[PDB]
Amino acid sequence: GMSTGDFCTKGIELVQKAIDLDTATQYEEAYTAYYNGLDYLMLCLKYEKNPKSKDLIRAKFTEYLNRAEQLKKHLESEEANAA
Ligand SMILES: [Cl-]
Structure with a gap:
């Protein structure tokens, strides 16, 4: 079964997906991948x-939690502005 390292790697992969989607401005899907x-x-x-x-992982956790919070606020602002 999955080792601790395997769980860590899945998290790294999902954050990399999020970073890529973020760079591509796909903010809804980037937020989900960060989460x-x-x-x-x-x-x-x-x-x-x-x-x-x-x-190292703790530092990345805080970095990408903060980025995810920024994207969430952006998405909420976009929804409010569109209404
Ligand atoms: Cl995802």
Whole structure:
């Protein structure tokens, strides 16, 4: 079955998908990918046994949580403006 490392990798892959969609301005789908990747990164952090990996993943978690919050606010503003 999936190792801790496998959960971490799935989170990294989902965040990379989000980053790419973000760059492409596909903000709704980027937000969803950030959300899903961040859940895997939280699981990674809880079980990670390598201290360097844990420190790096924690920094990425905070970085992309903040970006996801920015996209969520942007999407909410767009919805309000369109109404
Ligand atoms: Cl997704």
